[PDB]
Symmetry: C3
Subunit: 90 residues, 3 copies
């Protein structure tokens, strides 16, 4: 019933994203240098991990959301979240 | 009752920090290239995530410690741990 | 009984590694730019975290696998997984 978080950051400002899995829902809080605000990420799951990388100045984020034994990858390449190709056989 | 960890690293040596949430307490183990040792971070919580970034050679660490549904951000900018501005409405 | 994951990435392609702790076993799924595939990492544990760093083009990965209150570090320096020096007194 307690929340679980994952965090990533990029740059030097920096940008920070914190993902919280809470009661089956994963949401996102954002820092771009001046105030926390709610991000666009909203996906179901009880467990979350995240990684991100820059290509030049363009950020790419991958969030691994799991429900039960099933993990779904969600992708941000600057133009909205979409489901990635990740599969596992858990 | 089992522990949960989070890890971050920086540089090429590298520096590694491993945070362990255990029985409501989060502690920190450190590697700077030659031996593990206990770090200054000590904060309550049952769940931990971490991210870090360099500005030049200066490391900045953010630890997200959660108890129940409440997440507190702890900040290291080289001069002691202090509570950050992070809020969420879980 | 639900899975828990950790993720790391490097480069710009990028390379991604996703670790899944499931029913006491931690396994690894890999992306090197074109298709997910199963990695060599197989170690016991109920909880996983990971960090990685590059030295030039050489990747180094550290996986922190925990069972109960005992955390074991596993190391990849490009030539097979081996147990690291990490200790904690949980
Ligand atoms: O500026 C906020 C935002 O656009 O940053 C990139 C991603 O984290 C998005 O989910 C998020 O809404
Ligand atoms: O462009 C999306 C994608 O190819 O990005 C890299 C990996 O995250 C893949 O699983 C994912 O489908
Ligand atoms: O050298 C150890 C240390 O100073 O490194 C930076 C932070 O991880 C601190 O909590 C820690 O005590
Ligand atoms: O200087 C501290 C601070 O501004 O650093 C960036 C973010 O971690 C903020 O939540 C935090 O208050
Ligand atoms: O190319 C896959 C692989 O060699 O990548 C480096 C490590 O993640 C290994 O466990 C893994 O088998
Ligand atoms: O070469 C292996 C090693 O020295 O790498 C750095 C740290 O991960 C240590 O715990 C580990 O034993």
């Amino acid at each position: 019933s307690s929340v679980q978080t994952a965090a990533t950051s990029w740059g030097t400002v920096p940008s920070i994203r914190v993902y919280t899995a809470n009661n089956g829902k994963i949401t996102e809080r954002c820092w771009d240098g001046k105030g926390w605000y709610t991000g666009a990420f909203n996906e179901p799951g009880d467990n979350v991990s995240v990684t991100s990388w820059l290509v030049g100045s363009a950020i790419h984020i991958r969030v691994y959301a799991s429900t039960g034994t099933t993990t779904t990858e969600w992708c941000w390449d600057g133009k909205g979240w979409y489901k990635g190709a990740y599969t596992a056989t858990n």
